Amino acid sequence: NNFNSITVSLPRSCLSTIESESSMANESNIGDESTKKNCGPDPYII
Amino acid sequence: NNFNSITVSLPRSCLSTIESESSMANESNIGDESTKKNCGPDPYII
DNA sequence: GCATGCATGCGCATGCATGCATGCATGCTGCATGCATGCATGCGCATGCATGC
DNA sequence: GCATGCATGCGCATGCATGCATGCAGCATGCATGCATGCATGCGCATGCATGC
C-alpha cells in the first residue's frame, strides 16, 4: 500500500524455517541422512 | 586410485558452465527472462 | 553343630554417545565500472526539376 | 529561350541501445568450541548360601 517510490522485495530465504509452526513441519525439514534443508539463495516464484 | 589417506570430494559447482561444450548447451544455459542459470551451492547426487 | 569361602546384590564414582547454540572466518556472488561496437540521426551542400519573364 | 526557387540525394559528425568482463565489496553458509544431559561402567562392600570339619 505504498507505491510512491520511483521498495518491497521478495524474501531471500525460505520462511518455513523461521516459522517453525507445525510439529510435523519441523520434522519434514530434516532427513536426507545428516544435513540441513537448504532451499537455495532466492527460491520464490510469483 | 589413491585410497591411502585416513582426499577426493564432489564438485562444488555445476561443470556445465565451465565446459561450454555444445553450441546449443550455452543457449540452454540462458533464458528465464534476464538472469544466469544458478544450479545451487552443491548439486551432485551419486 | 560350628567355621569357612563363594556368589549374590548394594552403593559409590567415572566415563561416554547424543545433541544444539555461538563467534569467527571462509568462500562465493551480485553489483558497479569501464569500454568496444555498429546503427541511427540531424545536418549543410550540390544537383535537377518546376515556374515564371 | 532564359532566370529563378523548391524538392531530393550526398556527405559528415554525433549520440545511443545492446552487450560483456573485472575489481571490489557485501553477504550468507559451514565450521570449531563449549557445554548440558542422561546412560552405562566397574569397582569395593555387605549379605545369604553351600561346603568342610
Swiss-Prot record, chains A, B:
Subcellular location: Nucleus
Similarity section: Belongs to the MCM family.
Role description: Acts as a component of the MCM2-7 complex (MCM complex) which is the putative replicative helicase essential for 'once per cell cycle' DNA replication initiation and elongation in eukaryotic cells. The active ATPase sites in the MCM2-7 ring are formed through the interaction surfaces of two neighboring subunits such that a critical structure of a conserved arginine finger motif is provided in trans relative to the ATP-binding site of the Walker A box of the adjacent subunit.
Subunit structure: Component of the MCM2-7 complex. The complex forms a toroidal hexameric ring with the proposed subunit order MCM2-MCM6-MCM4-MCM7-MCM3-MCM5; loaded onto DNA, forms a head-head double hexamer. Interacts with CSM1.
Miscellaneous: Present with 10300 molecules/cell in log phase SD medium. Early fractionation of eukaryotic MCM proteins yielded a variety of dimeric, trimeric and tetrameric complexes with unclear biological significance. The MCM2-7 hexamer is the proposed physiological active complex.
Protein name, UniProt field: Minichromosome maintenance protein 5
Organism of derivation: Saccharomyces cerevisiae (strain ATCC 204508 / S288c) (Baker's yeast)
Gene: MCM5
From-to range in the entire protein, with total length: 195 to 243 of 775
